[PDB]
Protein: Ionotropic glutamate receptor 5
Amino acid sequence: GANRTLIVTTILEEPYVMYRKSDKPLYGNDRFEGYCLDLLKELSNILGFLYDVKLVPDGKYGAQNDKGEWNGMVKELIDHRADLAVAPLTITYVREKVIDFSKPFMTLGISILYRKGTPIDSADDLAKQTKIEYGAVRDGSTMTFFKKSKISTYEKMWAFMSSRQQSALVKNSDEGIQRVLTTDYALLMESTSIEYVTQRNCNLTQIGGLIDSKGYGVGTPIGSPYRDKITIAILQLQEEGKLHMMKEKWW
Amino acid sequence: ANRTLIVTTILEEPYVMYRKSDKPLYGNDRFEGYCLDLLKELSNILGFLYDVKLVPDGKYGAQNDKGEWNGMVKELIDHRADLAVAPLTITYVREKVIDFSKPFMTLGISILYRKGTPIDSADDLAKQTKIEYGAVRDGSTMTFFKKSKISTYEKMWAFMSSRQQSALVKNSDEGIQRVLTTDYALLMESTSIEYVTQRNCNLTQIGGLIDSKGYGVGTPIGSPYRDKITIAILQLQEEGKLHMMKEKWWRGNGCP
Ligand SMILES: N[C@@H](CCC(=O)O)C(=O)O
Ligand SMILES: N[C@@H](CCC(=O)O)C(=O)O
Structure:
């Protein structure tokens, strides 16, 4: 019979996945544009699948509690409510306990999103002072990096972000960018995103360099044939310069 | 007193370069660049003096048919240097034989070529004939192509290695000159491409990155400075000092 349509879990994040503006209503995948949708169209054609894009209901990437229970897109994959997660989702060893990733299609690191023309030049500068609040998206890999760090400065930063985490952690990056613009708040954010945001907001900058180095990959349930298949299709797109043309379009 | 460490390195802009002077210079004062600043910062943290020695064959390091290494990799294996502080790519094949610190910079292989052509990818170079292409002989880019099992890259390796490897170049400066003066594209690491295209505005990076790797400080297996260098790199990172060094040596006016 015809191929079962894949369910693709994703999350709203500029410029990876965004709502298309329209006079008329938009249904299905047509609700959506961005780097990840173009990626998905390419993967969809090289491998030949139809797909349904579903936004993760809780709107989170995925972190685990102390009982080993996950949420976000990670959970959607574990529980087979999705075949693939195609989003700016960080490949990490922790998540590899429970899901698979394709090889990476983009590389990145954690850095700071803050405002231009300040004394603040680094992580040490942020941790040491008081007036500027800082944190990360709740239940994403940046928050998890700090929560697990044994590095003395980052441990202090997690204590602060964790010492009332209701003021410091943000539900999403967009919520995150507002505090930046509005309050004295510095947002711990992935460099790919920081790049995009500052080309589009001229009061905003990256601060310091990368504090780590990671990749985004396509997520699958553990053992899925689509993992190796998507690794192969991503290599093809690298060969074709097609991922590069994708990045130039959206950034 | 503490033995002065021997540091193997290689000329490569802007990591390690001869400082300009009207007199000839000696010892460490000969050199400047990102890697010399990194070394100043490492030596303070760990408490050593160092002696900078350019790798005698001017190669980074690759293994021949007989399993024999050359380059800075060989200097380390043979214990002719304590440390390699250079833009030295951390690879699985080198990790079989020397150790590395955590990376201090990340990069990926890409393509340096002239601005204004239709070439936009490795596929486009690999399919055609008119434009010659290759990499620095006995460096990790050459090795990546040499060992690739990916069809496009195997073809590219067959080509750049044909006619007695005439498409390869001895060093990056020779490759950049080759790009500038003939119809030639250089397979080069992105950090280096970024430096070069700001200073040669008729050149550009083609396609994106075709792999993802790091530079790290190389030491012999077992070295009792390896983990201490990693701890220092970590400190430099949190303090923002790596980023400040990168700005010092890369940043300037974008192309008109
Ligand atoms: N890419 C991150 C989301 C954003 C962040 O945590 O900074 C993840 O997969 O969790
Ligand atoms: N960084 C490379 C040299 C440059 C190149 O191979 O493109 C190495 O460690 O061999």
The pocket of glutamic acid (ligand 2) is lined by residues B 60, 87-89, 135-136, 139-141, 188-189 (CB under 6 Å). DSSP finds ten helices and 13 strands in chain A. The longest helix of chain A spans residues 225-239. Residues 1-108+214-251 of chain A form a domain with the D-Maltodextrin-Binding Protein; domain 2 fold (CATH 3.40.190.10).
